[PDB]
Amino acid sequence: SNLNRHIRMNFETFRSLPTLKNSIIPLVATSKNFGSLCTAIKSCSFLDIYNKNQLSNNLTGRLQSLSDLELAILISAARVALRAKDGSFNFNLAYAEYEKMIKAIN
Amino acid sequence: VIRKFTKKNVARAKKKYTPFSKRFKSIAAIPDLTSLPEFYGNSRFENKLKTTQKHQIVETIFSKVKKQLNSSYLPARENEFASIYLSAYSAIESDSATTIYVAGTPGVGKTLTVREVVKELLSSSAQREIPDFLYVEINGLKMVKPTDCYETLWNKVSGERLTWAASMESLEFYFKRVPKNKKKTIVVLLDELDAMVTKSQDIMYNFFNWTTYENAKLIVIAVANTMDLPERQLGNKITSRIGFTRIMFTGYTHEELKNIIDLRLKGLNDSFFYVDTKTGNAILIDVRKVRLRMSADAIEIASRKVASVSGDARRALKVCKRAAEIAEKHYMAKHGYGYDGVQTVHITHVMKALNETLNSHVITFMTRLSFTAKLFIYALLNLMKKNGSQEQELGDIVDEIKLLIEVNGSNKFVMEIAKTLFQQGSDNISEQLRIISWDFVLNQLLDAGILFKQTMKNDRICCVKLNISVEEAKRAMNEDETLRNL
Amino acid sequence: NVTTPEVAFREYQTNCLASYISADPDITPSNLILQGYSGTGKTYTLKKYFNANPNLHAVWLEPVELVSWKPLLQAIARTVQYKLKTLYPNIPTTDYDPLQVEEPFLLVKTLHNIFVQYESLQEKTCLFLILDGFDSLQDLDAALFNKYIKLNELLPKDSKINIKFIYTMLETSFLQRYSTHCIPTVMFPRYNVDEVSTILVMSRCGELMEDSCLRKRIIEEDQFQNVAANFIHLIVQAFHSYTGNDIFALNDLIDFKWPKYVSRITKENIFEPLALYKSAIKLFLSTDDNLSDLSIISKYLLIASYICSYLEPRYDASIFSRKTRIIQGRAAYGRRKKKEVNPRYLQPSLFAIERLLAIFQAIFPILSALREESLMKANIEVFQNLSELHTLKLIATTMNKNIDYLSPKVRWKVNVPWEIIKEISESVHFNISDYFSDIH
DNA sequence: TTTGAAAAGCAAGCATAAAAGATCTAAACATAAAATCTGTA
Ligand SMILES: Nc1ncnc2c1ncn2[C@@H]1O[C@H](COP(=O)(O)OP(=O)(O)OP(=O)(O)O)[C@@H](O)[C@H]1O
Ligand SMILES: Nc1ncnc2c1ncn2[C@@H]1O[C@H](COP(=O)(O)OP(=O)(O)OP(=O)(O)O)[C@@H](O)[C@H]1O
């Protein structure tokens, strides 16, 4: 079942019953009738939506919210930081990498 | 007036500021302080903590053993008792002032024998062999401020309440200028003297300096945990100038601890008890007669284990009490008894009570963690095996976790768990840079004390070290059936 | 028993708010966190939820106004008392001074004393203390939030009034410091370009279409909403790469460029959107979000300090030395091979006073010339100008407080970027780029 | 007109000065209740 799959997943990652309760509580509380609650406990699709929300502001979901100029500046800064011996960079080096990158694309 | 800040919770004691040097016009104007009803002491809170019980307590046959092995209830301290008693007795009968410094590790019977010397001195003064004296007990670890000792001792001497600096000048004028015929002898127990000397050496030097005065009539017994406390708080010139008695208190041997334990258990071992068979209540002599015993080898190995490690009486008494508690727990569970032939405390009960002290829970805690936490510890152990630094950056741990997942693709468990670790089993969740519950297990290992993490806001270059050792971690990860084959 | 309002792209957040925030204290968590970055609609969604449920008793605190922990505790005590006596005016209460709260334990004692005098109420109620911007506190140590998590444990569990804490925070890493507490957390992810465009249209079209400049322009010479929405999407399409998904920055750009767009509206342009875009095309090629007197000795001292900061001191005789030799010798040959990194992209180097004065003398502009000695020496005006440059922080030192100016251990460095020194050199017609063209 | 050769340049390696700041102390600045001293009465 989906419930045993999510319990196994919690057992292998968190091993925390309060973590599971924090997801089960708005599954029960957002149900509108008894059949909806039974369907929600059959599917546990709300648990997937909850897990997606809990990761929406980490370094992955923040990356997908960037604009193309922001992404280009981030990639240029990462290139300068990878080429640097101590991983340090500033605005000028990142802009130089960005402008030669746009020039090589164009 | 508009204020720049406020102090709205100031509670100030009603303590006067004028020292004892201004209570009388001259040194010859001071009356007999012994013939004064406020001087020398010439507890209303018990009835607050009072109630009536409704049901009688069931006092089990083992509860006598437990109650009689408490620290609240002098074998082996006879030379120390003799030394302190003769120094204090000789200084009291000669109307002199002396100080005895007593040092030693906790639980070796320092405060107990100093108190017993003091009660023997009080009994001898009751027989008028020596003149009367006041007893003051000053504990440095029972204070808010270390200077409050000045407030305490003078309050025990004069009966008035002063601030600490005025109390210090009052005690100086009392021990220096007040004549010997108008004052009483004072015996002061300065317990925990290292608690009162941490900020500066004013209290130590003042209390030792007062015993050098010819008019003082002062006995100072100062008890501490190190021996070189006067030698490092004062110089050698000062400690040569006072000339205190120096007494060390070595830890008890196993035979002395054994005599202590069965002197606590002198009237209870190999004795008869009338036991109510339906409740379990026992009365020392429908009713069964039960003999009770503790074996000699149990106490012997308990006192042998304690004397090797610490040598103090508190640990030996407490493991005997814990063994009796374990035996009474099994007895009450077996007979189904409530709270309101031969019963023995065995060698195995003392073994288990000692094993709770001896063993550590670090390996047991680490073997019951989740796969992600054990993955973190395994990646950390791999990194300190490779580069040998004992501090690893967190980004290196992330890359090592990613490499261990990517390499073991043919393993059934890793193939089954990778979708959980990087997507939480969901196709709508993107592949994450950290594993699921990454910061959860990082915070859990930091809270447990397994890890140490430096303070750095860059999460990649921040370093993490094992805070326990490498061998418990190796023993923990070799227990796991998943980690030990890859 | 609660109302879930409509927020346009925050349906899940509103459902979680309805699942967690309730008037019954038995089914309400002690602590609730709403985590999201700036302009993610945390305040908007929480305000919509609490205005859709007027029976919920909420106290709003913004901890960016309180700065430190002690004013935050005092504000909690004061606002809790104020909300209770305007909520229950027929309950006689002793007005406790909030300034007596100087410790967290004092807050516990004061809240207990406030809550014991409301035991005459019928049902158990909830007090929602909204700490909107907890990690916007300026001091912000790590141990402060742990005091607020465990605050409910020190208060009586069978009290009529139970305090519920709702926290709003910005940074993910601050939240991840407290992951093992298992506090229920609702995330507010950043909007996308379509959601930002719809929110900007629905929040600004009624204000743009009813502005005074537009109704002055239609008298000087649905479709008003059409042209306001078209301006909003034109602003988004021109400036989304620059602003990112920031609602506030796009709102400032809309406010800056609305009157200049209204001022180029004609009868030929009002019903032709492409021609009206081309008529005011200058507003969409540049952001224009900006706000747009030294001595000659100060200017040349700044130029010389830049030269000292970005040229290594072993080749100055290969550039500045020009004077005829009576004694045989050789100057510096110069740098052999060029570096391929521009040194002005890095941090400035440190120099001594006399090197700066030597290069300043080298670069300062120039029978009666026999008694002239035409070379400017560092008099007190030069040192006064240098000290003025230090107190303006166009020059900096290695130490900042209790500065020993006369010690030889204290060195100096330039503190201006290349653009500032470039326009300074063009102000005095000095060729500063010629000292950097051959080096890299 | 060459020439050659000593001054200048450069770089790898390493010992050491020094920058940046983490941590802390003490002095200036500030408040406050209880006791104590002053001036009339
Ligand atoms: N010789 C002894 N005989 C009997 N009981 C003893 C003896 N020594 C210690 N104990 C028991 O152990 C307890 C600890 O003794 P005590 O308080 O005198 O130790 P201590 O040396 O002053 O310790 P600390 O430095 O921790 O204050 C006593 O209260 C008593 O119950
Ligand atoms: N879903 C929405 N529907 C309509 N307008 C919205 C919506 N989300 C945001 N807005 C508008 O954008 C403004 C900014 O949102 P808000 O102040 O709630 O963000 P926030 O995440 O609390 O910000 P901060 O971190 O700066 O405090 C709101 O005041 C509102 O005008």
Ligand SMILES: [Mg+2]
């Ligand atoms: Mg003791």
Ligand SMILES: [Mg+2]
């Ligand atoms: Mg807000």
